[PDB]
Amino acid sequence: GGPSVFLFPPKPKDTLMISRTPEVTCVVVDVSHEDPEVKFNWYVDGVEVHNAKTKPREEQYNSTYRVVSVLTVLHQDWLNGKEYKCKVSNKALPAPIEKTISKAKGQPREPQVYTLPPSRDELTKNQVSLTCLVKGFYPSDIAVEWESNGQPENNYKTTPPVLDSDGSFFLYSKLTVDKSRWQQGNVFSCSVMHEALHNHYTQKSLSLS
Amino acid sequence: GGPSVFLFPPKPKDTLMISRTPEVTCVVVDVSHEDPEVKFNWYVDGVEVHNAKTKPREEQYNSTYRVVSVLTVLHQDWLNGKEYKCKVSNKALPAPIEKTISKAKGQPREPQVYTLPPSRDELTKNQVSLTCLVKGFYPSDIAVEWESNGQPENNYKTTPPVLDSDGSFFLYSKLTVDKSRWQQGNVFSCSVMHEALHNHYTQKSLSLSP
Numbered sequence: 001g002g003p004s005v006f007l008f009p010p011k012p013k014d015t016l017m018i019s020r021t022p023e024v025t026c027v028v029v030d031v032s033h034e035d036p037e038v039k040f041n042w043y044v045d046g047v048e049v050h051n052a053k054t055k056p057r058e059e060q061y062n063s064t065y066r067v068v069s070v071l072t073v074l075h076q077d078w079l080n081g082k083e084y085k086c087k088v089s090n091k092a093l094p095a096p097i098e099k100t101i102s103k104a105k106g107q108p109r110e111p112q113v114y115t116l117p118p119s120r121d122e123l124t125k126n127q128v129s130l131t132c133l134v135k136g137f138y139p140s141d142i143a144v145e146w147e148s149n150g151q152p153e154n155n156y157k158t159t160p161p162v163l164d165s166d167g168s169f170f171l172y173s174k175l176t177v178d179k180s181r182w183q184q185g186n187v188f189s190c191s192v193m194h195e196a197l198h199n200h201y202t203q204k205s206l207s208l209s
Numbered sequence: 210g211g212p213s214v215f216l217f218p219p220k221p222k223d224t225l226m227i228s229r230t231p232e233v234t235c236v237v238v239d240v241s242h243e244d245p246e247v248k249f250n251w252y253v254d255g256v257e258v259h260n261a262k263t264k265p266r267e268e269q270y271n272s273t274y275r276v277v278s279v280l281t282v283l284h285q286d287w288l289n290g291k292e293y294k295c296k297v298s299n300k301a302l303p304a305p306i307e308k309t310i311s312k313a314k315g316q317p318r319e320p321q322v323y324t325l326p327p328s329r330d331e332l333t334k335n336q337v338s339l340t341c342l343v344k345g346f347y348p349s350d351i352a353v354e355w356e357s358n359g360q361p362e363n364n365y366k367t368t369p370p371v372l373d374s375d376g377s378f379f380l381y382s383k384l385t386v387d388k389s390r391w392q393q394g395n396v397f398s399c400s401v402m403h404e405a406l407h408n409h410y411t412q413k414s415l416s417l418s419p
């Protein structure tokens with residue numbers, strides 16, 4: 001009978017590196033032509049702040065609109081658990097919509113990062129799988145990349161975080177490389193970014209031993 | 210805001226073992242007191258079927274009804290990609306609600322199952338991680354289990370399927386064992402059930418290599 005509001009956290013990576021800009025994003029769907037104007041109010045722990053930015057809106061292929069406010073956040077505020085309140089008012093709304101988001105609560109825990117070589121069985125293929133196991137980490141916000149010789153390896157896929165039996169999270173990252181690259185003896189690095197790591201970052205190497 | 214309909218597919222194990230009973234489940238929620246009568250029609254590839262089993266409505270604590278209908282599917286109908294339509298009629302609807310579900314479309318691909326021992330750096334811990342890599346399967350419906358010496362191992366978690374570059378899926382299963390059980394030389398088995406495996410099953414073993 002009116003729109004819907006959705007609130008999104010910053011990218012894990014954006015909050016760990018001071019050079020990057022972490023953003024909280026407030027998204028309004030089902031905005032129809034007849035009642036086209038949406039507003040936004042923002043709050044960080046009950047205050048209001050004014051540095052949010054409304055980027056102008058897009059017509060959907062179902063003839064409705066998508067409208068987005070974007071608040072930049074302080075890295076340390078996000079990591080310290082401050083609460084970020086989106087407030088949406090619209091003529092079709094009977095009561096304004098508040099929505100809230102925050103970082104997962106609890107003592108952060110350091111990921112353990114382990115590289116595993118391809119299995120003997122796989123070595124009959126033209127391409128092989130380099131595995132990075134990242135386990136024991138909390139909260140689930142994490143970024144994982146691969147490189148070789150300081151250069152980014154982009155042919156990888158990473159699983160979402162999975163809740164482990166001790167309340168921490170784990171994931172696996174799979175890098176796929178030409179078998180010959182693995183045989184010739186190239187070093188591949190899995191890098192992991194996480195708040196509980198020293199300087200928010202660690203790398204583990206993997207090469208043919 | 211009238212009733213809504215959720216249509217649930219069978220369990221991956223159920224469609225792969227003839228001994229099991231695969232079901233499609235159509236569930237209707239937010240049925241009102243003022244219009245409580247619900248009708249289901251079921252279709253398999255658009256042809257009506259009449260062997261569903263519908264339970265009588267159950268009132269929820271929020272003063273709405275929930276109504277469930279169960280269709281028993283034949284194993285080979287599901288694997289052959291038949292489509293299952295639940296049609297739901299209620300006098301609070303302006304038109305009946307239809308939902309359709311089937312096995313994801315595309316040519317099935319056989320999973321490659323590879324087992325991977327603990328990192329050397331992990332054998333510092335009291336517990337260690339045995340890994341099962343399952344890749345290159347399609348569709349993503351799969352079941353993964355661990356055992357040793359006949360019996361199920363409880364302490365394992367499996368990732369959801371992840372869409373790979375080539376349009377197939379992969380996942381990993383992690384089994385956590387006490388380091389001594391790995392040092393003692395016990396054999397552990399990752400078994401995988403998928404429609405593109407022979408007898409829909411394969412099992413690969415892992416053990417401390419001498």
Ligand SMILES: *[C@@H]1O[C@H](CO[C@@H]2O[C@@H](C)[C@@H](O)[C@@H](O)[C@@H]2O)[C@@H](O[C@@H]2O[C@H](CO)[C@@H](O[C@@H]3O[C@H](CO[C@H]4O[C@H](CO)[C@@H](O)[C@H](O)[C@@H]4O[C@@H]4O[C@H](CO)[C@@H](O)[C@H](O)[C@H]4NC(C)=O)[C@@H](O)[C@H](O[C@H]4O[C@H](CO)[C@@H](O)[C@H](O)[C@@H]4O[C@@H]4O[C@H](CO)[C@@H](O)[C@H](O)[C@H]4NC(C)=O)[C@@H]3O)[C@H](O)[C@H]2NC(C)=O)[C@H](O)[C@H]1NC(C)=O
Nearest residue numbers: 004006008009011025026027029030060061062063064066
């Ligand atoms: C008219 O058109 C639009 C567009 O159609 C869409 O695009 C077209 C081209 C076609 O492809 C369509 O098939 C396609 O659907 C329709 O818009 C869709 O409408 C629904 C609402 O009805 C929205 O659903 C919400 O989605 C969010 C997740 O949103 C992210 O992921 C989407 C991809 O999966 C992506 O499209 C979104 O843009 C968004 O992406 C994120 O964006 C941020 C900011 O940009 C970015 O920083 C992120 O990186 C990015 N992430 C990505 C890309 O992965 C989902 O969270 C919502 O689910 C909650 O609410 C449900 C209730 O509807 C509920 O069932 C769920 O359980 C879930 O509930 C919450 O879960 C959490 C955690 O458990 C928690 O808060 C609570 O437990 C619970 N909260 C509750 C219950 O309130 C929700 O599903 C789509 O975003 C939207 N699509 C687009 C493109 O905007 C529209 O419906 C059409 N209108 C019609 C047909 O009438």
Ligand SMILES: *[C@@H]1O[C@H](CO[C@@H]2O[C@@H](C)[C@@H](O)[C@@H](O)[C@@H]2O)[C@@H](O[C@@H]2O[C@H](CO)[C@@H](O[C@@H]3O[C@H](CO[C@H]4O[C@H](CO)[C@@H](O)[C@H](O)[C@@H]4O[C@@H]4O[C@H](CO)[C@@H](O)[C@H](O)[C@H]4NC(C)=O)[C@@H](O)[C@H](O[C@H]4O[C@H](CO)[C@@H](O)[C@H](O)[C@@H]4O[C@@H]4O[C@H](CO)[C@@H](O)[C@H](O)[C@H]4NC(C)=O)[C@@H]3O)[C@H](O)[C@H]2NC(C)=O)[C@H](O)[C@H]1NC(C)=O
Nearest residue numbers: 213215217218234235236238239269270271272273275277
């Ligand atoms: C009034 O009460 C009733 C019952 O509530 C009950 O009583 C109240 C008082 C409280 O005590 C409640 O806590 C209690 O539960 C409420 O009914 C609920 O209504 C919601 C909708 O508002 C339904 O939500 C859907 O949930 C399903 C998941 O449902 C399974 O899992 C649930 C737990 O996770 C479990 O509770 C359910 O029973 C059900 O369990 C499965 O059951 C099948 C069949 O029996 C069984 O074989 C399975 O083994 C079993 N699984 C289990 C137990 O784990 C979820 O799938 C739905 O998500 C879709 O819809 C969203 C839009 O609504 C969308 O945003 C989501 O992304 C998702 O959308 C789909 O996305 C997929 C890909 O993700 C895609 O393929 C589809 O195209 C897409 N579909 C779309 C867009 O439409 C959804 O979240 C609850 O299940 C239902 N509860 C029950 C018990 O039936 C009612 O809302 C209350 N009314 C009020 C308060 O006004």
